[PDB]
Each structure stands twice: as structure tokens, then as C-alpha cells.
Design an enzyme around this catalytic site. Sequence first.
Site, PDB file in Angstrom:
ATOM      1  CB  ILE A   1      40.630  37.261  31.944  1.00  0.00           C
ATOM      2  CG1 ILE A   1      39.946  36.387  32.979  1.00  0.00           C
ATOM      3  CG2 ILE A   1      40.824  36.453  30.663  1.00  0.00           C
ATOM      4  CD1 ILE A   1      38.750  35.644  32.393  1.00  0.00           C
TER       5      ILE A   1
ATOM      6  CG  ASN B   1      43.179  40.618  40.661  1.00  0.00           C
ATOM      7  OD1 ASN B   1      43.452  39.837  41.563  1.00  0.00           O
ATOM      8  ND2 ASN B   1      44.105  41.211  39.923  1.00  0.00           N
ATOM      9  N   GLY B   2      39.261  38.691  40.307  1.00  0.00           N
ATOM     10  CA  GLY B   2      37.890  38.455  40.733  1.00  0.00           C
ATOM     11  C   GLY B   2      37.988  38.568  42.241  1.00  0.00           C
ATOM     12  CB  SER B   3      35.705  39.394  45.041  1.00  0.00           C
ATOM     13  OG  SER B   3      35.096  38.348  45.767  1.00  0.00           O
TER      14      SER B   3
ATOM     15  N   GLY C   1      40.443  36.283  44.399  1.00  0.00           N
ATOM     16  CA  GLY C   1      41.192  35.400  43.529  1.00  0.00           C
ATOM     17  C   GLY C   1      41.508  35.938  42.153  1.00  0.00           C
ATOM     18  CB  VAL C   2      43.827  35.196  39.627  1.00  0.00           C
ATOM     19  CG1 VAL C   2      44.121  35.574  38.180  1.00  0.00           C
ATOM     20  CG2 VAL C   2      44.698  35.985  40.582  1.00  0.00           C
ATOM     21  CB  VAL C   3      38.980  35.302  36.697  1.00  0.00           C
ATOM     22  CG1 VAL C   3      38.070  34.511  35.751  1.00  0.00           C
ATOM     23  CG2 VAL C   3      38.288  35.578  38.028  1.00  0.00           C
TER      24      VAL C   3
ATOM     25  CG  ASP D   1      30.733  43.651  44.859  1.00  0.00           C
ATOM     26  OD1 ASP D   1      30.713  44.871  45.158  1.00  0.00           O
ATOM     27  OD2 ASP D   1      31.701  43.093  44.274  1.00  0.00           O
TER      28      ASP D   1
HETATM   29  O1  LIG Z   1      34.061  35.647  31.723  1.00  0.00           O
HETATM   30  C1  LIG Z   1      33.935  35.673  32.952  1.00  0.00           C
HETATM   31  N1  LIG Z   1      33.292  34.759  33.698  1.00  0.00           N
HETATM   32  C2  LIG Z   1      33.287  35.155  34.970  1.00  0.00           C
HETATM   33  O2  LIG Z   1      32.720  34.551  35.893  1.00  0.00           O
HETATM   34  C3  LIG Z   1      34.012  36.375  35.105  1.00  0.00           C
HETATM   35  C4  LIG Z   1      34.192  37.095  36.325  1.00  0.00           C
HETATM   36  C5  LIG Z   1      34.066  38.520  36.366  1.00  0.00           C
HETATM   37  C6  LIG Z   1      34.247  39.237  37.577  1.00  0.00           C
HETATM   38  C7  LIG Z   1      34.548  38.548  38.772  1.00  0.00           C
HETATM   39  C8  LIG Z   1      34.671  37.133  38.750  1.00  0.00           C
HETATM   40 CL1  LIG Z   1      35.017  36.286  40.189  1.00  0.00          CL
HETATM   41  C9  LIG Z   1      34.499  36.410  37.541  1.00  0.00           C
HETATM   42  C10 LIG Z   1      34.452  36.673  33.771  1.00  0.00           C
HETATM   43  N2  LIG Z   1      35.261  37.711  33.258  1.00  0.00           N
HETATM   44  C11 LIG Z   1      36.174  38.611  33.818  1.00  0.00           C
HETATM   45  C12 LIG Z   1      37.083  38.209  34.856  1.00  0.00           C
HETATM   46  C13 LIG Z   1      37.970  39.139  35.417  1.00  0.00           C
HETATM   47  C14 LIG Z   1      37.973  40.477  34.953  1.00  0.00           C
HETATM   48 CL2  LIG Z   1      39.099  41.424  35.766  1.00  0.00          CL
HETATM   49  C15 LIG Z   1      37.089  40.939  33.904  1.00  0.00           C
HETATM   50  C16 LIG Z   1      37.064  42.220  33.420  1.00  0.00           C
HETATM   51  O3  LIG Z   1      36.733  43.215  34.123  1.00  0.00           O
HETATM   52  O4  LIG Z   1      37.439  42.372  32.231  1.00  0.00           O
HETATM   53  C17 LIG Z   1      36.185  39.961  33.352  1.00  0.00           C
END
Ligand SMILES: O=C1NC(=O)C(c2cccc(Cl)c2)=C1Nc1ccc(Cl)c(C(=O)O)c1
Lengths: 337, 342
Positions: B28, B30-32, B34-36, B144
Site C-alpha cells: 500500500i 511507504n511508511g517511515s 519501511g513498507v506497509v 511528524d
Molecule cells: O491503514 C494504515 N494503517 C497504518 O498504520 C498506515 C500507515 C500510514 C502511514 C505510515 C505508516 Cl508507518 C502506516 C496505513 N495506511 C497507509 C500506509 C502507507 C501509505 Cl503510503 C498510505 C497512503 O498514503 O495512502 C496509507
Amino acid sequence: SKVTTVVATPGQGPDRPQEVSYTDTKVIGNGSFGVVYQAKLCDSGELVAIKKVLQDKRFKNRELQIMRKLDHCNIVRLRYFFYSSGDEVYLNLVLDYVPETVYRVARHYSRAKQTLPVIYVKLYMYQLFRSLAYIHSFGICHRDIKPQNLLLDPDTAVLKLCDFGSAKQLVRGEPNVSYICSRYYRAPELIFGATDYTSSIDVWSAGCVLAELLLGQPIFPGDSGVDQLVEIIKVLGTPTREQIREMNPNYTEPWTKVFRPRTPPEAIALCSRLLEYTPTARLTPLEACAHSFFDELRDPNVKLPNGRDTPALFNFTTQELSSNPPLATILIPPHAR
Amino acid sequence: SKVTTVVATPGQGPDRPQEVSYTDTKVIGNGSFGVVYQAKLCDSGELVAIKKVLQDKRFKNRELQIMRKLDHCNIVRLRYFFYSSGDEVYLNLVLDYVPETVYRVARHYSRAKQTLPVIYVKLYMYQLFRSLAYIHSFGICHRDIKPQNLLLDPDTAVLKLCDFGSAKQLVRGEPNVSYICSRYYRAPELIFGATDYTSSIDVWSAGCVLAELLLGQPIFPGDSGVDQLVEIIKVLGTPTREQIREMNFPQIKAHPWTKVFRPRTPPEAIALCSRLLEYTPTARLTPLEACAHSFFDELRDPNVKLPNGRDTPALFNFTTQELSSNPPLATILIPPHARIQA
Ligand SMILES: O=C1NC(=O)C(c2cccc(Cl)c2)=C1Nc1ccc(Cl)c(C(=O)O)c1
Ligand SMILES: O=C1NC(=O)C(c2cccc(Cl)c2)=C1Nc1ccc(Cl)c(C(=O)O)c1
């Protein structure tokens, strides 16, 4: 149409104001603390740019003082400067006009899924380095080297550095703010908040511009200081403690796999020598010009893709070489007049 | 269809290993650090997010330790966490999954010339502040706060704060890096390189999010620290020397905020902005003080409903932990109809 006449002071030499007239004034964008316009001088019919900023009045404008003191073929020139109003007092700098920016040009190649021919990368990078060797020789640091402040004339391949609104005389011992310089181009020591940085921050920025031109996108992107460092580390490895000490003494706590396969070994070699954690280890502007990556520019038969000759590249002055005179033997090729 | 089963540790319950099975692992974003991924839990067929990051055995994961101790209706919940393969070790965090981000939504309105209906601005901002009052009560600073880390469920109007990869326990006396926080949202003291900053930097960031939602674009943009300061000064005037000292230029004066927003903008919203976006860190409202601001009085109305007809989310279920900052505020935070005996 409308003609404006002013009594402006020449940028260099005798402080003897003269009448100057221009016309066809259109807004050509936006700079540092003001607005840049374009207009045409009536006398010569030549195009010029006019940066305009609000003036303190009980304080001398620092950009103006630094500009009146520079004269180099790779730096936009201050032709005149005069005052105007709107009470409010405005300072107007009449500078050289240059049609393109390295920014907009690189973007063209970028979205067309093309990569700027290496010859241009050489011509542009070399000229940027000469301009840096020059202002640094006066102890001046630009502090905002990014593609947007690199002007280009498409036909002649001449590049001029601009926007000195952040430039400053850096004196060993005095402190300097660390919040200068745009994102992606800031040297590590700036990210770590250092205030005792030297002119080598301009070299790191230039290193980022080179890498960007070869890559087709910024090499160290990131919305925050943290992200940018992660990118830098992914390429330069983790900083040793010694390296962290030389950037900022108050911390808190491959290179070929990077560019496409075609890219010349010299370009990559130069990048690695510019983008170094240790500030004192990065090449100097002058040392960069003499790097082998620019050997093609020193060839007597070199010509531009459009058939024209290359711009002035060897008209070095003593001031320019003061950094390291012995380099003239390479900087000035055998055939060069 | 493929199915993955792992033995994970509950997020907060006692350490009773549970067998978890999920399917449809898709990326879905990039999370800081890592990848989510997104994934569907086999059994309940419920969606979850899985943030996968590289875990260097030398140290224990600071995001993990922080999240294990958190449980609030407006924060993403750590459901389970387990380790996996890669020749490296990957820490996996199974988090709540939420469909939209404030970034994406404010953007749809933005590139179409509309602004988010104020009712939503209230619902979203209020919840963000509760989430901040909560983590701050533990001495934790997110560091952040930006639209991209604000998740939203479109239908329920529930907002959850996410991405704790930069969060840290701030201890009076210890120094902290000043290169954290995304551009546009960094508090002045961070720009000036301060290392003795407090949790009020999160409030400044939140102030920037509010202003952005009302304006339709960032309020303090700039590619460099200098540019950003020029923007801040154009609005808060020039910093006095005293103000510069508490934080750690062509002089301009006080800019009547009302000039900043569109006409029609509520006086309360502007009042709140000015009280959040302050040079002096100690002068900015606290998260809790912000929730009790008059701008949120409409949320305390008993008849308030969402534009789609539904009721508002939980907004008054405050806990002692949450109010510890300043208990006497409960008298406002918890409206009368929320006190009616059952
Ligand atoms: O549903 C979610 N639970 C979460 O904790 C996150 C999330 C969102 C941003 C950073 C991190 Cl580390 C996790 C979701 N969603 C998500 C993850 C990545 C991206 Cl890149 C996006 C987005 O911007 O669409 C949304
Ligand atoms: O011709 C020019 N001489 C100059 O000194 C500049 C210039 C460019 C950037 C900053 C400043 Cl302060 C001046 C020119 N051009 C210019 C000005 C503004 C913009 Cl916004 C652009 C541009 O990006 O196209 C180019």
C-alpha cells in the site's frame, strides 16, 4: 509602449549614476526575497532582468554589496541598481537576462523519459565549478546551489549562477545560521545543524546537481532531515564516529549500483569525490574543473551538438586560480589562447 | 489462493502467542523506515495493515516499545507483532487498516478549488488533539504530524494518528535531534536548530494542519529554512528578541490573521490558529486546552450529526490518563448530556 527612466548606479567601478531607460516590462518569475521582472533597455535594445526587494534603509543590503564586487563570465552580472518607491523603499538590481534554467531543462528530459546528453552535463557542471572557484576565492559562499539558480542560454551552452540573496562572507571563527540551503541539496553538516560550516557546502550541493543530471531525479530526496539522511546513508554507508565529529561536533544520535550502466566511470568518480561526509575531503571547485570527467571539454575539436563552438572555458584569471596556481597546467590546455 | 500463518504476540494483552492467518498481501505504500502492506485476516475477513521494517539485532525497536503501551480510539492500534525472514530480520507490525488519509482527501478538494466543509475540519482537528493529549500525557512526542499521517474512515469520520517511526520519550534535560519533522510543519525552534524542544512542536504542526485545511494549501511553504521563516514572519510579525531566546531578517509587523483566510471563515478557527502558531513554545495551547476551545463548541452540541445523517464518533469518552494534564477541564470537555445518568 511605456518607457521608464531612472538614474541608476553602475554595478562596478566609479559610483557615478547615469540615466537608464527600459520598456516592455513583464514579470518573469520569483526570487529569494523579491520579484524578478524582465525588461528591454532602450539604448541597446538588450534584454535584462530586474530583481526588486524592500529596503531596510537604516541597513546596507547584503546581496547588493556582494554583487557589486563580482565579475565572472559564469555569474549573472549586476549592471545597475537604483531605488524606487510604492512610503516603502524598494531596491532594484538590474541583472543579466538568461532564457532558461537547469531546472526546467532537466525536467524536459525527465518527463520525456530521456537523459540529458553527457556532453551538456559536462559543459554545465564545469561552468558551475568555475563560478564557485571564483566566489569562494573571495571567501563568499552561495548557500543555495540548486538547479533553479543555474541559468542557461540554450544556443551557446553558457551557464550563469544567480540569486545571491543567501550568499555570505564566511569567516573562520564566526557562526552562521544552518537553516539555509534548499531540500535535497543540503550538505550533511547542515542537516545535523552545524553552524561552523565552510564553503564546501556549495560543493556538496553541486555534487547533488551532477548526480541529479546523470540520474534523472534527485539523488537524496526526503520531506524531512531524517529521510534525507537515510537516503544519503544508503549510498555513502553509515558515518563513522570520526566523520560525525567533523560535520557537527555537537551530534545527538556501492556507487556504481546507483547510476544506469551507460553512465561514464569519470562522472561516477567525480560524484564520489564531491559527495563526502568529511567536509575537508571534498574536492575544491578548482580541483573539480581539472577532473578527468571534463577532459572532453579540453579537446581542441570539441563542438556543441548544434554545430557551434563551446563557450569561453579557459579564460582563467589569477584571482580564480589563487586557490591552487599549479592547476593552470591542466586547466589551460595546450591549444587554448 | 495463498495463505500465510504466523505465531505473533498480542499488541497489548498479556504475552499469549496467537496463531494468525492472513491472505492477499499487497503493497500500500511507504511508511517511515519501511513498507506497509495490506492483508485480509482469514477468519473475520477483516483488513489490516502490516508495516515491515528491517530490525538490526543491536538495539530494540523504539517504535514497537512506544506502540505496545498505547491504546486510544484515535490512534492506530498495534494488533500483533512478529518477526520474519528476509539474510536479515524483519519486524512486522499488524496495525488497524484505514482506507483514506487526510492528505489525499484535502487534496481532492484542493485540486478542484473547494475547501473541506468546516464541520469535517472540526471533527478531524478535535480528534487529532485528543490523540496528542494522550501520547503527550506519557511524555511522548510524535515529531511528524502532517496530513499524510492522519488516517480517516470516510463513512464514520473517525480519525487515527499513525506512523510512530519518529516518536520519542522527551526527557527534560536530555537533547534531541532537530532534523525531525517534515517541511511545512516544523516549529520555528526546530528551524533554528534547537535541541531542547518540548512536545509543543506537535502542537505547532497540528496548527499548520488546521490552517492548511481552512486555506486549501500549506500556510508556511518554502524549499529552505529561510523561505519558511519568511512566510512565518509575514504572518506572526517579526520575533522579538525575547521570543527568539525562548525558541533558541527584513523586519515586518503583526499580520491580522483574518487577512490570511477566506472571508466566511469562522472567527473561532482563526482564534485557535493564532493560539497554536506561536513563536514562544510555552505560549502555545496544550492539546487538551485546544479541545476545549470554542471552535469545537459545535461538537459538544447534543443535536450535532454528520452531513451523511449518522451520529458523530466517540468524542467524550475521556479517561483520567487523558485529563491528567489538567483535570479541571473535564467540566468543559464533557458536555452535560454526556453526564446524564443511565
Ligand atoms: O491503514 C494504515 N494503517 C497504518 O498504520 C498506515 C500507515 C500510514 C502511514 C505510515 C505508516 Cl508507518 C502506516 C496505513 N495506511 C497507509 C500506509 C502507507 C501509505 Cl503510503 C498510505 C497512503 O498514503 O495512502 C496509507
Ligand atoms: O534572467 C535572470 N536573471 C536573473 O538574475 C534571474 C534570477 C533567477 C533566480 C533568482 C533571482 Cl533573484 C534572479 C533570472 N531569471 C529568472 C527569474 C525568476 C524565475 Cl522564477 C526564473 C525561472 O525559474 O524561470 C528565471
